[PDB]
């Protein structure tokens, strides 16, 4: 995408989302990041939407194949093929975050957003990991989420939607990856309750966003308890 203007890449990412062409969307956003400039709030959301959809589809396919495999070499080979492609996308996202989105992000909102992404893509790698590096992959996710949590608690109100989504995802990490369901439940409960107590400060539109994510926290708590 090196020959396309930054603004054209952003425009085409928005078109690709409307057309449900998420692989294209991700390629346009990778090209935009590689222009070397920081991303605005809207642009960070385009980047996240694109890769979350791509990897989300790979994860769903890997789960179908892994279930068939658990129940000739073809099933294992094909699961391995999908797994390698998933790992490749996660590595690409982590590479964008490391070169150089995180290091240039100084405002709390941008830095937390990117560290939450970093935790998420290490979490997706952990979902498929089995080898000598599995513990290290899990700890890489934990470390990214933890740094994001520490910044969010110092710099953002308890209803901030990035802070809430981070806590949601870190709670999923605890439950599904780290084998720490009590930590997951405690984080989700404390996050929900501290957000509830700050809703009175919000406008109607901020209220809607915070309560939307609070409902996701509650949905998980209902599933886990």
């Amino acid at each position: 995408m090196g020959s396309m203007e930054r603004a054209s890449l952003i425009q085409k990412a928005k078109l690709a989302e409307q057309a449900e062409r998420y692989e294209d969307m991700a390629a346009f956003m990778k090209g935009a990041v590689e222009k070397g400039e920081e991303l605005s709030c809207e642009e960070r959301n385009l980047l996240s939407v694109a890769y979350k959809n791509v990897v989300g589809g790979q994860r769903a396919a890997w789960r179908v194949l892994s279930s068939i495999e658990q129940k000739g070499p073809e099933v294992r080979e094909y699961r391995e093929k999908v797994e390698t492609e998933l790992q490749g996308v996660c590595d690409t996202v982590l590479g964008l975050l490391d070169s150089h989105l995180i290091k240039e992000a100084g405002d709390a909102e941008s830095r937390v957003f990117y560290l939450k992404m970093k935790g998420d893509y290490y979490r997706y790698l952990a979902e498929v990991a089995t080898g000598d590096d599995k513990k290290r992959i899990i700890d890489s996710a934990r470390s990214a989420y933890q740094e994001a949590m520490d910044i969010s608690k110092k710099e953002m109100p308890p209803t901030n939607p990035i802070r809430l989504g981070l806590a949601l995802n870190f709670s999923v990490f605890h439950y599904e990856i780290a084998n720490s369901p009590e930590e997951a439940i405690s984080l989700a409960k404390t996050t929900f309750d501290e957000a509830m107590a700050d809703l009175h400060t919000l406008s109607e539109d901020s209220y809607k966003d915070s309560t939307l994510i609070m409902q996701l926290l509650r949905d998980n708590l209902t599933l886990w308890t």
Binding site: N45, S48, V49, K52, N53, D120, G165, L168, N169, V172, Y175, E176, D209, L212, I213, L216, D219, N220, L223, W224
Partner: peptide, 9 residues
């Protein structure tokens, strides 16, 4: 369970 979606929907 569920993680954050890419868009509000």
């Amino acid at each position: 369970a569920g993680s954050i979606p890419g868009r509000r929907s």
